[PDB]
């Protein structure tokens with residue numbers, strides 16, 4: 001009936017680094033997806049209270065969104081680039097679990113995922 005607290009976006013107890021791959025994930029990958037026509041349902045956690053989706057957090061136990069990913073990159077939350085790529089993959093997979101194949105929101109997610117896969121295939125050394 002209530003929303004869960006959003007995912008953690010900062011942890012001072014975890015070591016921090018800047019890498020070319022982490023910089024690419026913020027400046028190219030997230031930037032590209034964030035400005036997309038279909039980004040907006042994915043820019044913040046699913047508000048299941050406001051959207052009247054009482055079953056959402058009854059089946060989605062690893063929620064993820066691009067608002068969370070943006071803050072995690074900004075706060076140096078990720079040590080390895082694959083940690084960030086996994087969060088994008090979790091966000092897409094969650095959409096493909098809760099929603100029937102061919103649904104409006106699934107088609108929007110698929111359009112974003114096509115662009116995501118192109119950019120990850122060009123991830124720098």
Ligand SMILES: COCc1nc2cnc3cc(-c4c(C)noc4C)c(OC[C@H]4CCNC4)cc3c2n1[C@H](C)c1ccccc1
Pocket residue numbers: 040041042046047051053056094095098099103104105
């Ligand atoms: C008219 O209301 C406007 C509106 N704002 C938002 C914000 N976030 C939404 C997130 C989702 C969503 C995602 C992603 N992954 O799982 C879910 C569930 C969303 O899904 C709609 C499906 C659930 C049941 N059938 C469609 C909608 C969000 C949303 N919306 C509306 C409800 C909306 C509906 C369809 C497509 C885009 C936006």
